[PDB]
Write an enzyme that holds these catalytic residues in place. Structure first.
Site, PDB file in Angstrom:
ATOM      1  N   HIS A  67      22.882   8.562  56.262  1.00  4.57           N
ATOM      2  CA  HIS A  67      22.572   9.954  55.956  1.00  4.57           C
ATOM      3  C   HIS A  67      23.484  10.896  56.736  1.00  4.57           C
ATOM      4  O   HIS A  67      23.988  10.545  57.803  1.00  4.57           O
ATOM      5  CB  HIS A  67      21.109  10.256  56.279  1.00  4.57           C
ATOM      6  CG  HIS A  67      20.764  10.076  57.726  1.00  4.57           C
ATOM      7  ND1 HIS A  67      20.148   8.946  58.218  1.00  4.57           N
ATOM      8  CD2 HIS A  67      20.955  10.890  58.791  1.00  4.57           C
ATOM      9  CE1 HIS A  67      19.971   9.071  59.521  1.00  4.57           C
ATOM     10  NE2 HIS A  67      20.453  10.243  59.894  1.00  4.57           N
ATOM     11  N   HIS A 153      28.725  15.791  59.619  1.00  4.48           N
ATOM     12  CA  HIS A 153      29.240  14.438  59.798  1.00  4.48           C
ATOM     13  C   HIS A 153      28.205  13.398  59.380  1.00  4.48           C
ATOM     14  O   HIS A 153      27.005  13.674  59.361  1.00  4.48           O
ATOM     15  CB  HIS A 153      29.639  14.218  61.257  1.00  4.48           C
ATOM     16  CG  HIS A 153      28.490  14.330  62.213  1.00  4.48           C
ATOM     17  ND1 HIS A 153      28.076  13.292  63.018  1.00  4.48           N
ATOM     18  CD2 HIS A 153      27.666  15.368  62.489  1.00  4.48           C
ATOM     19  CE1 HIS A 153      27.046  13.683  63.747  1.00  4.48           C
ATOM     20  NE2 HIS A 153      26.779  14.939  63.444  1.00  4.48           N
TER      21      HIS A 153
END
Length: 222
Positions: A67, A153
């Site tokens: 994720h 990120h």
């Protein structure tokens, strides 16, 4: 009001297809990075000369359903995302799916992460307050001098004891470091350039962005 029913952590779950392609690229990198003399030459500084057989590269664990973080509601200190979280438009955006482009990948002895740079759409819909981060999608003009993909990120590697949240903080600093005038080690490749900060932190700039469809997810809990 009524009750504390506001979001605390926001992020988008990358499509199972993208993770497969992205993972394949990350693995190939670690292999080429190790073969390179530039890295092996500084391995002592990266591994601190205290392991066994550079197993740190394999030690890191990579989760399947990866994720990517977006904005942290926190509470009130972050007025930016705060207003964003209070925008029904973004709330509905969750079921939506946007393609995220990967600019560069970062490798830290503590954790591993990838730099993702959304499009102008995601940027325009990004809160100003959170932008305070070293590098924000809205800071594109500034990105020209300082790396990008820190604000957003994806988690790839994590140590046994450290939190994933720390991964993001490192990324933001990495980019700010290069632009800070440090830029210790620098190398230009056929696909991209790799730069490492004086203390450490090694990241490769994927000259060729990598797009990947992802969906917006939200979590409201303490």
């Amino acid at each position: 009001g009524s009750h504390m029913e506001l979001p605390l952590f926001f992020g988008w779950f990358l499509l199972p297809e993208e993770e497969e392609r992205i993972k394949c690229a990350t693995m190939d990198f670690l292999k080429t990075l190790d073969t390179l003399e530039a890295f092996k030459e500084h391995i002592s500084e990266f591994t601190g000369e205290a392991e066994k057989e550079v197993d740190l590269e394999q030690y890191f664990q990579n989760p399947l359903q990866l994720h990517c973080t977006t904005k942290f509601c926190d509470y009130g200190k972050a007025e930016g995302a705060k207003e964003y979280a209070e925008l029904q438009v973004v709330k509905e955006s969750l079921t939506k799916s946007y393609e995220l482009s990967v600019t560069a990948l970062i490798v830290t002895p503590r954790t591993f992460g990838a730099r993702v740079a959304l499009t102008e759409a995601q940027v325009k819909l990004w809160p100003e307050g959170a932008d305070k981060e070293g590098v924000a999608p809205a800071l594109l003009p500034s990105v020209e001098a300082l790396p990008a993909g820190s604000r957003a990120h994806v988690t790839l590697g994590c140590s046994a004891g450290v939190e994933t949240v720390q991964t993001g903080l490192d990324l933001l600093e990495i980019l700010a470091l290069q632009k800070e005038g440090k830029e210790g080690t620098q190398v230009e490749m056929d696909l991209g350039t790799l730069t490492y900060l004086s203390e450490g932190r090694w990241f490769l700039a994927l000259r060729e962005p990598i797009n990947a469809d992802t969906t917006f997810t939200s979590f409201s809990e303490d």
